[PDB]
Design a protein around this ligand. Sequence first.
Ligand code: HEM
Ligand code: ASD
Length: 398
Amino acid sequence: PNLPPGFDFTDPAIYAERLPVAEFAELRSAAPIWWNGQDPGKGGGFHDGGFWAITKLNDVKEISRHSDVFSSYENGVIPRFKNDIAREDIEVQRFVMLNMDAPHHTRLRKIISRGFTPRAVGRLHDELQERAQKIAAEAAAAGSGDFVEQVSCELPLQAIAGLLGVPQEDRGKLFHWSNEMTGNEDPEYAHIDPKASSAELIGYAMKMAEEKIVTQLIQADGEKLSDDEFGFFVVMLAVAGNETTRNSITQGMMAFAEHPDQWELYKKVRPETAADEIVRWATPVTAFQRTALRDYELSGVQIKKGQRVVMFYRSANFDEEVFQDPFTFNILRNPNPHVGFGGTGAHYCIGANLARMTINLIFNAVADHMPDLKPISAPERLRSGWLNGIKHWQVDYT
Ligand code: HEM
Ligand SMILES: C[C@]12CCC(=O)C=C1CC[C@@H]1[C@@H]2CC[C@]2(C)C(=O)CC[C@@H]12
């Protein structure tokens, strides 16, 4: 492929500035499965020499379905940490369901599904609709500001608070922890320590479990979460369901600003297809990885036991063989077989319907209260090699 020597698709230096869209396109054309070498000390906490870059939608789906071969446990699924991270600090992440394999995963997912029934999620609708309307009304009243802080941040957090039934008075500290929980190497957040925050959040969760959806999770059925498993569950929600949905909202609104005919159409009909096009466009999770438990032949490439494969959802969601005009933002996109929520399989995002609800509610409220919003200046991108994040974005709400 035509790429610079030493190029690394997980390099946080790239994501601080841009998405490497041209480079992913080059792989899909010239080398759709490509060994991405990493030199010593430059592997984002991994010291195995590199990973297979997976750029095609059908390959990502194949990996995701074959969790019997492609493990989330052996190396976790986050493909990029600070270069100096201790191995122990990666391995401790195996205590969240996301980074477990069957049968352990199977048991926890079965229990935790009690929190994501369409009944549990559907019950949040009216409180989240109310919140979304008030958020959008207060942003409009401010006239201008940081869209991320004023519009994108709060509703995901309130969706988590509401699912868990957190008392109103505790939501401030919960949101504080939650916002320091996902690791990044951004200089704006160099003072944050996800370790301290995670200990404190687990402590708060376990006390909540002691004092008692939380009920359904900790009451025996005799399967239940232990108090510590409930703590780990709450940490996982903070990493899985916060900045993900937030970045879908920011990048969805960036796409509307860049595609005004789509925003006009959205404002009229609020179509059913919008939320998934927003998620495909935004691809909040750029990439998650797996580790081969045995040799496996994938589209003619001989993947070897113990090797990492990185599923670039950001490539796969723009796969020209699957999506007509993939670089066109189309809120009526159909079909839309995107992998923003992952490939179908054991680990497929359990919060996907909650995320869609959150997106629809906030975008309805934005259309209602700020139909003429326009950007003032450029989005500020997060320095992360796996999260596709916007830290700030100044906009004129009127
Ligand atoms: C637009 C927003 C979101 C995006 C893009 C997103 C994306 C993802 C992806 C890519 C995965 C891994 C799938 C796989 O490995 O096959 C995942 C898993 C997960 N997500 Fe989401 N997610 C979002 C919102 C949420 C929300 C709102 C919640 C809950 C509050 C949530 C909870 C989870 C959990 C608990 C898992 C782990 C599932 C497992 O390992 O079995 N996510 N998500
Ligand atoms: C918050 C965290 C780090 C930053 C990041 O990006 C992802 C995670 C999720 C798993 C956490 C971990 C911090 C340490 C935790 C709390 C444990 O001791 C068990 C699970 C693990």
